[PDB]
Amino acid sequence: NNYDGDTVTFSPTGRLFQVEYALEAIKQGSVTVGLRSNTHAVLVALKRNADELSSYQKKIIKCDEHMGLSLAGLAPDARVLSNYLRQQCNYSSLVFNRKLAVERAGHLLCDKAQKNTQSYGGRPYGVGLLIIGYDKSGAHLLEFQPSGNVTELYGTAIGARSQGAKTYLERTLDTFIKIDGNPDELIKAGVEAISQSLRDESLTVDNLSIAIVGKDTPFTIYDGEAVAKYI
Amino acid sequence: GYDRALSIFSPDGHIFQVEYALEAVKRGTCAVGVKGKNCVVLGCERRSTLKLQDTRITPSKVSKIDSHVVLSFSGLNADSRILIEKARVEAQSHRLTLEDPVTVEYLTRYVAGVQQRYTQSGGVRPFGVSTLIAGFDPRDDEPKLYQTEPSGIYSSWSAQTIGRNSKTVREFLEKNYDRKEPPATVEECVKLTVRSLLEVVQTGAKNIEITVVKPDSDIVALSSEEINQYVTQIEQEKQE
Amino acid sequence: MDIILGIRVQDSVILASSKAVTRGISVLKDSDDKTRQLSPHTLMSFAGEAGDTVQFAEYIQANIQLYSIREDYELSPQAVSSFVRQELAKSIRSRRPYQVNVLIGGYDKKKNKPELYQIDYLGTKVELPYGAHGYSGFYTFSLLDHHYRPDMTTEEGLDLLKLCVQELEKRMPMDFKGVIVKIVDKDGIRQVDDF
Amino acid sequence: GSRRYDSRTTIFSPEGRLYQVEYALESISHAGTAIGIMASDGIVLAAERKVTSTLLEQDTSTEKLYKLNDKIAVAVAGLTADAEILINTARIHAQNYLKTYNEDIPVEILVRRLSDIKQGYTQHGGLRPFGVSFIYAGYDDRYGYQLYTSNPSGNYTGWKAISVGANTSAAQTLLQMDYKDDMKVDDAIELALKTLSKTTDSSALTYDRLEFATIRKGANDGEVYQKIFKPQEIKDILVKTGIT
Amino acid sequence: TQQPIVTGTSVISMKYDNGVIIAADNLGSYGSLLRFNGVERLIPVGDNTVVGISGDISDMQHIERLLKDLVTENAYDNPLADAEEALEPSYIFEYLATVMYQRRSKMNPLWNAIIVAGVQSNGDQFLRYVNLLGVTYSSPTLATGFGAHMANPLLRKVVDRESDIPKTTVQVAEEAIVNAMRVLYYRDARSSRNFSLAIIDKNTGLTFKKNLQVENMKWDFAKDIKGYGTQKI
Amino acid sequence: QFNPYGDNGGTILGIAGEDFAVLAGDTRNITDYSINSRYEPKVFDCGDNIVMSANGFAADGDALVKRFKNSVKWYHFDHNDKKLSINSAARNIQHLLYGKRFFPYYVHTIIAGLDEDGKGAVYSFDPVGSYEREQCRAGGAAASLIMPFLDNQVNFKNQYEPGTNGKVKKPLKYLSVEEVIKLVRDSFTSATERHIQVGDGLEILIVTKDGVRKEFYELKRD
Amino acid sequence: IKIAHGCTTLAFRFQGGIIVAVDSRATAGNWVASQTVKKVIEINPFLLGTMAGGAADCQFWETWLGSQCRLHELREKERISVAAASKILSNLVYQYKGAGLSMGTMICGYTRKEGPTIYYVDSDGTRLKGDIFCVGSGQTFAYGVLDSNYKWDLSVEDALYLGKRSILAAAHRDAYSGGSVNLYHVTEDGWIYHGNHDVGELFWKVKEEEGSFNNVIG
Amino acid sequence: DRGVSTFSPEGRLFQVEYSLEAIKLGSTAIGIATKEGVVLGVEKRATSPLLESDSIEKIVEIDRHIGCAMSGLTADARSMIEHARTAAVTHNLYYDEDINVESLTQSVCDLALRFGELMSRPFGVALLIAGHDADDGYQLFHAEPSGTFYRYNAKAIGSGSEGAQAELLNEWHSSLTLKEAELLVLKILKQVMEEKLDENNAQLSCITKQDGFKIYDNEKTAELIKELKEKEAAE
Amino acid sequence: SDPSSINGGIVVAMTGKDCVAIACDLRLGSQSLGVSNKFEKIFHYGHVFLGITGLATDVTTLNEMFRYKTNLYKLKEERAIEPETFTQLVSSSLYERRFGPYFVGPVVAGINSKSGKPFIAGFDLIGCIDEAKDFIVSGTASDQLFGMCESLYEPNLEPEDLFETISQALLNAADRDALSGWGAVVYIIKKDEVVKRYLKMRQD
Ligand SMILES: [Mg+2]
Ligand SMILES: [Mg+2]
Ligand SMILES: [Mg+2]
Ligand SMILES: [Mg+2]
Structure with missing residues (x-):
């Protein structure tokens, strides 16, 4: 009310309203799902269009050969944060000849988003990210929120009506976690998960966006006729 | 450094600081630009509430940017000096690097760009000035007349007016100016410019300034008596 | 760049400047005009390091032309020469100084007098009846000391100047490919096409 | 952050006016009146000191009239402290010009630069403008004797006779009435004093409440002299014109 | 632009079937003066890497501090710091190699020759060289300073190419290194008798041996050498 | 005084065929009269069917390759995974080299691959970025030995048709991958005989539309 | 190492526009680094630049010039003048003066307002307009043939040959020039390439047909 | 007042949403993409008849293969075009090739x-x-x-x-x-x-692969206007 | 390439009974080549006189600089600067350029308007003050001037006698120096009158 003019102000109950309003931008964004087994990690994203004449907004971004994310909210902010991740992944490779750990990736995003919530003039990031990757400790899935809070998970979903997919994954936890050495079945589980967040619309060929990374699989994105298999 | 965003959007999609800068232009003394077949004429109002003035030394309303281009304006007098100075420097800088004087379009585009930069830079307000820029491109005999405004938009005009009561004189020019046949001579162009100012000015004494620009850096400012002859001629023809 | 001369007479200033541009063992050009018009009644010749000369000359020219437009008024030769000297005086203590020597010939319209200023690359200004830069002086100065009179006409000045060029052409080691002569007077600046 | 406390000094009103410039002019309108009158053979500067106290040291005082160089002077109307900042800048600019061109600075050039500085404070920087209006009285070999004025907006104009500060409306009418082009300095002196004497908010105009200066060619042959009047000299010129 | 003051001489090393061996004497020379005798020029990083450094000792101590700090930094927010995300020899080398080249590029080098010996997580032997110029190379045998001229020839008789590595045992490899250290004591005027030796094995891990001495030297024949040509007594 | 440059020796060679291109280079690394490594590869696959070598000062060579490899990576990110053409790569490298015009990479750079018409392409660079496409280029320590042999055997220079009174030249034609490798191997065995900084091993990288293949051959180790 | 320093280049104005002719050799000391060097940079379809001195300096900055010319005509909706184009380059190298740039170049073009125009630009800041220019180690040799045979009223055919013959003259005598001759003809509607001519074959062809080079046995 | 980069309770940036209103006030611009080419057309909208309409430049070239049309506060577009032109030419300088349309758009955005x-x-x-x-x-x-x-x-x-x-x-x-x-x-x-x-x-x-980006003359457009009126009256 | 001896020139100052004298040659050259015989080296700011030898561009620059500073001084102080104060100003200004100095040998001369005391002073190029009762010397013939002044000078000379002594000191010193001469000027300075005399000397 009187305490939402900028990010530097606390409310009487101890809330940061600008951070919460940034969180609200994610809820308006299109749904995206993340889930992993022990061998692979999968991102599934429902793309959104302006109208029938327009293209579908690309949700998934590659960060390295072994890491990448999906976005929900302000796409330009995801571009800034993904670009930062690309550089950090790259710094780790050039300097230490070392693939960046997915956990450190999360820590770096948390610290970058945090600085924007404590200083005058700036604003919080208006986007949520689901980072998947495969490093020296196996497959990983992270959930980034622009408050700074990063969380490692087996599965999750963010965006509009994400609660449906999140409930499904919470039920299916024991099943999909053991889908080891089988990419197409892990994707199917992710496609069935995101389907629990659909209303009136269904998954078409230029609507669905899938990405995967794993043990002997570089981070690769599938769009267009390549995702027709999973409809 | 002072950073404040002074020029910003409002709910209805307007930038009030730019629009309030236009109000300053509307307050300013009237300025008119008319281009003929082989010349351009810049007319300018001077308010007569100021007697005991020294017209020798008082800043003239029409300013030379280069030997072939001139700039008149309406709005804040102090602001206009900053735009004129920058334009004059750019005019010499263009000659230095391109080995050729600026075109009237280029000089206008530069001045308009400066005005625009002040509409989305921190710590600054827009220029409370609109300009009429006129002249002849190097080795060219086609007359040029351009207008700029605080927002930064610019465009070419067969004839145009800015300042206070400019809507009245624009009404006059819109019916009196023929596109198919512009003022063929210098006399015809000056007369039409004086006529248009006489709709608004008051008296045709030391209230009207006229500057005539012709091809190949041929610019001259008319004196009181010379202008007064046009005023005397128009009034006698009017009584009919 | 090598030979630049200047002679102030009764009613005008005459500048003579060599036409040759040599680089290595080749004369690349034999019709080079080593001068810039700073204002209608002010002319500057120049000689020195390659590139620096023209870059400096045009920079000064631009600045004076900017002044002319701003004030709608022509600066006096004395005022221009002082501005030029200061620019060189700054330059000498810079990271990379302008290695340019100049002569400034002008006609002061307020005084109705011709004026010749000699300024070297250090910023050393002197007003003279006749001047030169480089090795040119070593021949001409003594010749001018003898033949020069303060009340000479423009035509007498050109004959005196011919005498200098002849001496240079006889005793100078390098072929400087003649000179471009220019006159500065009450009516402005004009070039002598046949010299 | 600090946005909360920003007055926004450099913005437009809905009507297209600069709030702070207008309010600065309102400030200046309460300042002691200063008059400048330009004659054919010189210039007069007259100014009224702000409500003097009897224990004020009058002879070793300077409030209104300041010297910029040998050929140019100014009369001040507004905050004295603000004016001195600008005066020192103007004095330096005049010396820079002399150093560069070996010629005394033309009056207009000095006036323009000082007016450009004031303009800057209205367009950028977020600072309050200088609450000062000047009357510039000076000479050069181009235009001869010149009078100018500048105000917090940074706009300057040339004049034959002009007033700034308090009661300028009444003062400008009286000057417009009695001024003529073939006027001499001694006549202009009398007009300047008569105008202040009628527009003053004081009971009677006296020597101790005035600052006076002339710029004549009254020196020996083709050279300009600046005369900042002493207390006793103002007392004499006030008796000579029949005011006291 | 530097000049090295307190200096360390040869660092020698080689690969064998299960790991790598590295050695360097304990001397800190001050020109011709053999100033300091208790200088350790082999610095372990974790339990799987040893960095051997020759050249300027002040710069060596700086590199020690960097490596010490690297271990600390790696442990931050790293639950697998003593497991999968532990520092590898290749990581440690590439870091140093980056620093060495950046410093030479700023015309302010770390005046050293460095050999990073270790064993990777997958059991692979790691042995690579870097110096003040940022120059890097790898070989079955690596040596610095005089070691390059005298040790490498001897070590290459054992492991001449890649295929000789599985055929070389830790006993044979250590023998060649200790022998090389003796030869360097005979012939390098800025060497000491006392040295340290380190073995990094993929099975038995890191074995760090301190206070070793050159022994079984041949000096007896000196008594028979008289004069410089014609002298008989 | 500290000298920031050094000479790591070695020599490289690039030859372009009709539908292929090879980029060879010996595996010896040296300083002064000492051998540092008998197998230190300096010909690298950089992706997008581009092979590269920066012979001379290895520290600058490795820095440059590393930076170009990185450039290829960021070209994919910024331009929707577009393939970097050999001509585009060349121009990019010019800017990398010239970027350090006043503190150069002391290296003779050569890249090889296929142009956009599928034909074999070799580009060569000086230390400060001047580049040119050629059928043939040797670089490094023994370039002066190998290059005139290449002029004679690849481009058939100074060879005229027998009996034509030296009037008709020997006609230019593309060489087979077999014939090119023969010329590479003979060029390096010859260079090894007469240049002390050349030897130990020869590594060739062959680039066709199918990908990047490698071949290795022993060289004299003295 | 030493870096490439490929030179003989000329360019002259005549009735039919401009001829540009260059050799092809690049050297590193006595070592002939390349016989196939392109010493004419095609800045754009209307402008040409010549390469002498630093090979990299000339290449890098004259393609950079082509970028500045393209940006000019996008903003001004008009072809850039040869005067302006040359001055963009000369002002740039003047900023780098002292740093060690090495450039001897002819900026050649043909516009409506100027006609055929040639500007010699130099790494020490020199910018000269002229009718005939000749730059490189073999420039003096090429000047001798040019000066004795040049006329304004040469035909496009004869002018092309004169430029070709002047390079040949330099290629013969100057040890650091040769390889092949590249010819260009600049018109108002753009430059036209007139082929690569190997000096080895051109010398014997010219010797026989012209009767020249009697000193040499053939 | 309030911050420039402030979020609304609905999760949108106030200043961005307000700028969109300014764009609605702007003159109409239409673009159509085909396999034979892309067409760009704009409403000039002269504020007065005395204004020379040919000086209204709302269609603009970025490179030979990329064109641009604008709508809204058109003065703000100048620096966007300047950046686009520089990005396009700069990429050609670094990579000796045309720059992708998407990459150009991304750079502007x-x-x-x-x-x-x-x-x-x-x-x-x-x-x-x-x-x-x-x-x-x-x-x-x-x-x-x-x-x-x-x-x-x-x-x-x-x-x-x-x-x-x-x-x-x-x-x-x-x-x-x-x-x-x-x-x-x-x-x-x-x-x-x-x-x-x-x-x-x-x-x-329009912009075609063969001839590149071209702004049509007033003579050429006039014939297309006449062709359009005839075809609508024909049924 | 020795800045202090490219252009050449000399200045000398002396005191007398209730008066001071300062004198300089008129030469400006470029090493061997004589360029100007009108180059005066003495300037004045109010009643304070400053002579400057050395590199001519700096001589000109410093004159313009001290004119600049003495003008602002007068406007703020509402009085003319005195010799003692000016001396300090010259010293301050020179030492400000300690590690990039003006290549000059300045000499202050004048009479204090309050006390009436004759005053002279000399400086090195970095502003060290050399105060003296008798005389100050400067320029490319300083050695010669030192020798002339030390033998010819006596205290309490009348203005007319002092003129002869300083003139003979300058002339004979200048004639033993190649880079000095080509005319000479002498300023005789009394409390409220100043006479300037051009000397006839050999023109080689
Ligand atoms: Mg050997
Ligand atoms: Mg030859
Ligand atoms: Mg003498
Ligand atoms: Mg003599």
Whole structure:
């Protein structure tokens, strides 16, 4: 009310309203799902269009050969944060000849988003990210929120009506976690998960966006006729 | 450094600081630009509430940017000096690097760009000035007349007016100016410019300034008596 | 760049400047005009390091032309020469100084007098009846000391100047490919096409 | 952050006016009146000191009239402290010009630069403008004797006779009435004093409440002299014109 | 632009079937003066890497501090710091190699020759060289300073190419290194008798041996050498 | 005084065929009269069917390759995974080299691959970025030995048709991958005989539309 | 190492526009680094630049010039003048003066307002307009043939040959020039390439047909 | 007052949303993409008859293979075009090739959100960026001040955008010829424009692989206007 | 390439009974080449006189600089600067350029308007003050001037006698120096009158 003019102000109950309003931008964004087994990690994203004449907004971004994310909210902010991740992944490779750990990736995003919530003039990031990757400790899935809070998970979903997919994954936890050495079945589980967040619309060929990374699989994105298999 | 965003959007999609800068232009003394077949004429109002003035030394309303281009304006007098100075420097800088004087379009585009930069830079307000820029491109005999405004938009005009009561004189020019046949001579162009100012000015004494620009850096400012002859001629023809 | 001369007479200033541009063992050009018009009644010749000369000359020219437009008024030769000297005086203590020597010939319209200023690359200004830069002086100065009179006409000045060029052409080691002569007077600046 | 406390000094009103410039002019309108009158053979500067106290040291005082160089002077109307900042800048600019061109600075050039500085404070920087209006009285070999004025907006104009500060409306009418082009300095002196004497908010105009200066060619042959009047000299010129 | 003051001489090393061996004497020379005798020029990083450094000792101590700090930094927010995300020899080398080249590029080098010996997580032997110029190379045998001229020839008789590595045992490899250290004591005027030796094995891990001495030297024949040509007594 | 440059020796060679291109280079690394490594590869696959070598000062060579490899990576990110053409790569490298015009990479750079018409392409660079496409280029320590042999055997220079009174030249034609490798191997065995900084091993990288293949051959180790 | 320093280049104005002719050799000391060097940079379809001195300096900055010319005509909706184009380059190298740039170049073009125009630009800041220019180690040799045979009223055919013959003259005598001759003809509607001519074959062809080079046995 | 980069309770940036209102006030611009080329057309909208309409430059060249049309506060577009032209030429300098239309659009869109308390406010202008490259062929992009860009088969922006977009929805198909697209832009412009459409108050342009980006003459557009009127009266 | 001896020139100052004298040659050359015989080296700011030898560009620059500073001094102080104060100003200004100095040998001369005391002073190029009762010397013939002044000078000379002594000191010193001469000027300075005399000397 009187305490939402900028990010530097606390409310009487101890809330940061600008951070919460940034969180609200994610809820308006299109749904995206993340889930992993022990061998692979999968991102599934429902793309959104302006109208029938327009293209579908690309949700998934590659960060390295072994890491990448999906976005929900302000796409330009995801571009800034993904670009930062690309550089950090790259710094780790050039300097230490070392693939960046997915956990450190999360820590770096948390610290970058945090600085924007404590200083005058700036604003919080208006986007949520689901980072998947495969490093020296196996497959990983992270959930980034622009408050700074990063969380490692087996599965999750963010965006509009994400609660449906999140409930499904919470039920299916024991099943999909053991889908080891089988990419197409892990994707199917992710496609069935995101389907629990659909209303009136269904998954078409230029609507669905899938990405995967794993043990002997570089981070690769599938769009267009390549995702027709999973409809 | 002072950073404040002074020029910003409002709910209805307007930038009030730019629009309030236009109000300053509307307050300013009237300025008119008319281009003929082989010349351009810049007319300018001077308010007569100021007697005991020294017209020798008082800043003239029409300013030379280069030997072939001139700039008149309406709005804040102090602001206009900053735009004129920058334009004059750019005019010499263009000659230095391109080995050729600026075109009237280029000089206008530069001045308009400066005005625009002040509409989305921190710590600054827009220029409370609109300009009429006129002249002849190097080795060219086609007359040029351009207008700029605080927002930064610019465009070419067969004839145009800015300042206070400019809507009245624009009404006059819109019916009196023929596109198919512009003022063929210098006399015809000056007369039409004086006529248009006489709709608004008051008296045709030391209230009207006229500057005539012709091809190949041929610019001259008319004196009181010379202008007064046009005023005397128009009034006698009017009584009919 | 090598030979630049200047002679102030009764009613005008005459500048003579060599036409040759040599680089290595080749004369690349034999019709080079080593001068810039700073204002209608002010002319500057120049000689020195390659590139620096023209870059400096045009920079000064631009600045004076900017002044002319701003004030709608022509600066006096004395005022221009002082501005030029200061620019060189700054330059000498810079990271990379302008290695340019100049002569400034002008006609002061307020005084109705011709004026010749000699300024070297250090910023050393002197007003003279006749001047030169480089090795040119070593021949001409003594010749001018003898033949020069303060009340000479423009035509007498050109004959005196011919005498200098002849001496240079006889005793100078390098072929400087003649000179471009220019006159500065009450009516402005004009070039002598046949010299 | 600090946005909360920003007055926004450099913005437009809905009507297209600069709030702070207008309010600065309102400030200046309460300042002691200063008059400048330009004659054919010189210039007069007259100014009224702000409500003097009897224990004020009058002879070793300077409030209104300041010297910029040998050929140019100014009369001040507004905050004295603000004016001195600008005066020192103007004095330096005049010396820079002399150093560069070996010629005394033309009056207009000095006036323009000082007016450009004031303009800057209205367009950028977020600072309050200088609450000062000047009357510039000076000479050069181009235009001869010149009078100018500048105000917090940074706009300057040339004049034959002009007033700034308090009661300028009444003062400008009286000057417009009695001024003529073939006027001499001694006549202009009398007009300047008569105008202040009628527009003053004081009971009677006296020597101790005035600052006076002339710029004549009254020196020996083709050279300009600046005369900042002493207390006793103002007392004499006030008796000579029949005011006291 | 530097000049090295307190200096360390040869660092020698080689690969064998299960790991790598590295050695360097304990001397800190001050020109011709053999100033300091208790200088350790082999610095372990974790339990799987040893960095051997020759050249300027002040710069060596700086590199020690960097490596010490690297271990600390790696442990931050790293639950697998003593497991999968532990520092590898290749990581440690590439870091140093980056620093060495950046410093030479700023015309302010770390005046050293460095050999990073270790064993990777997958059991692979790691042995690579870097110096003040940022120059890097790898070989079955690596040596610095005089070691390059005298040790490498001897070590290459054992492991001449890649295929000789599985055929070389830790006993044979250590023998060649200790022998090389003796030869360097005979012939390098800025060497000491006392040295340290380190073995990094993929099975038995890191074995760090301190206070070793050159022994079984041949000096007896000196008594028979008289004069410089014609002298008989 | 500290000298920031050094000479790591070695020599490289690039030859372009009709539908292929090879980029060879010996595996010896040296300083002064000492051998540092008998197998230190300096010909690298950089992706997008581009092979590269920066012979001379290895520290600058490795820095440059590393930076170009990185450039290829960021070209994919910024331009929707577009393939970097050999001509585009060349121009990019010019800017990398010239970027350090006043503190150069002391290296003779050569890249090889296929142009956009599928034909074999070799580009060569000086230390400060001047580049040119050629059928043939040797670089490094023994370039002066190998290059005139290449002029004679690849481009058939100074060879005229027998009996034509030296009037008709020997006609230019593309060489087979077999014939090119023969010329590479003979060029390096010859260079090894007469240049002390050349030897130990020869590594060739062959680039066709199918990908990047490698071949290795022993060289004299003295 | 030493870096490439490929030179003989000329360019002259005549009735039919401009001829540009260059050799092809690049050297590193006595070592002939390349016989196939392109010493004419095609800045754009209307402008040409010549390469002498630093090979990299000339290449890098004259393609950079082509970028500045393209940006000019996008903003001004008009072809850039040869005067302006040359001055963009000369002002740039003047900023780098002292740093060690090495450039001897002819900026050649043909516009409506100027006609055929040639500007010699130099790494020490020199910018000269002229009718005939000749730059490189073999420039003096090429000047001798040019000066004795040049006329304004040469035909496009004869002018092309004169430029070709002047390079040949330099290629013969100057040890650091040769390889092949590249010819260009600049018109108002753009430059036209007139082929690569190997000096080895051109010398014997010219010797026989012209009767020249009697000193040499053939 | 309030911060420039402030979020609303609904999760939108106030200043970005307000700039979108400014764009609705702007003159209409339409773009249609076909397999034979992309067409760009704009409403000039002269504020007075004395204004020389040919000086109204709302269609602009970025490179030979990329064109641009604008709508809104058109003065704000100048620096966006300047950046686009520099980005396009700079990429050619670094990579000896044409730059992809998408990459060009992305570079422009990176400027969009570089505002706050960088420039003081978002851009008050939307751009239609049309072009061709070898990879994705003929393309039309809509670049907003939010930093977002959508590719479109056809798109209208400005005051008559929602009405024109609904018309483009029905009329567009994947087999449109260039000539058909030209007429379609003129047809839809004439519907939404206030004043009567002619060659002086409306401007056409296109970009083809063969001839590159071209702004049509007033003579050429006039014939297409006459051809359009005849075809509508013919049934 | 020795800045202090490219252009050449000399200045000398002396005191007398209730008066001071300062004198300088008129030569400006470029090493061997004589360029100007009108180059005066003495300037004045109010009643304070400053002579400057050395590199001519700096001589000109410093004159313009001290004119600049003495003008602002007068405007703020509402009085003319005195010799003692000016001396300090010259020293301050020179030492400000300690590690990039003006290549000059300045010499202050004048009479204090309050006390009436004759005052002279000399400086090195970095502003060290050399105060003296008798005389100050400067320029490319300083050695010669030192020798002339030390033998010819006597205290409490009348203005007319002092003129002869300083003139003979300068002339004979200048004639033993190649880079000095080509005319000479002498300023005789009394409390409220100043006479300036051009000397006839050999023109080689
Ligand atoms: Mg050997
Ligand atoms: Mg030859
Ligand atoms: Mg003498
Ligand atoms: Mg003599």
